[PDB]
């Protein structure tokens, strides 16, 4: 049984790095900033929350998060992660019959093309899923997250999902670096914005990077488009506030912060 579980590709086997000091605020931090609104991304969030809840000693709550992920899909290789997490959670809760049932579901979907493996499968969807999980867990995971999306992009250079993941990963990693420039700095965000034209989050990142390279006027256009569609709250306001602060538009910056609260 344990041999089977270790072969799964899911939050329980991805060695997500979360140090103790991050623990107390992680769940809120994850929920406060939903970068995309499509259902597959929301399923990813519920899976990550289940894992985090388990680590906080909250197995009952962890299971409920997995059932929420299950229910959303109820309305494809992208169920493998949720099922793998169920198998682990039921194993932990001492419900082995149910764990076996979920292992069976996985094995079934992995019953190859010629996928060599019994319980895992190489595919860009799961590489993307691993990347999004790493991205949500904070800094120590960012290089791995970037590498995950890179792996997808190598084979599918125009993939909307991994272009965005790579771009956000590169941006966050860029932040850690000592400031000032590098050629094609704007390239990954531009590509991500073109491939994901309905995402305001990546537009604000692009706007901030543009502003940083003395292209504040072009940057402001992207800020405005983002804000025009942000029915998708809420962390977008924080980044937009920073843009206007740097510009010198204090009234706008302040209203955006009040909205972020």
UniProtKB/Swiss-Prot annotation:
Changing residue 25 to A: Abolishes PPP-RNA-binding. Changing residue 37 to A: Decreased capped RNA-binding. Decreased translation inhibition of viral RNAs lacking 2'-O-methylation of the 5' cap. Induction: By type I interferons, dsRNAs and viruses. Changing residue 199 to A: No effect on capped RNA-binding. Phosphorylated. ISGylated. It comes from the Eukaryota. Changing residue 29 to A: Loss of capped RNA-binding. Plays a key role in the innate immune response as part of an interferon-dependent multiprotein complex, recognizing and sequestering viral RNAs that lack host-specific 2'-O-methylation at their 5' cap. By distinguishing these RNAs from host mRNAs, inhibits their translation by competing with the translation initiation factor eIF4E. Could also prevent viral replication through its interaction with DNA replication origin-binding protein E1 of several viruses. Causes the translocation of E1 from the nucleus to the cytoplasm and can also inhibit its helicase activity in vitro. This is Antiviral innate immune response effector IFIT1. The gene is IFIT1.
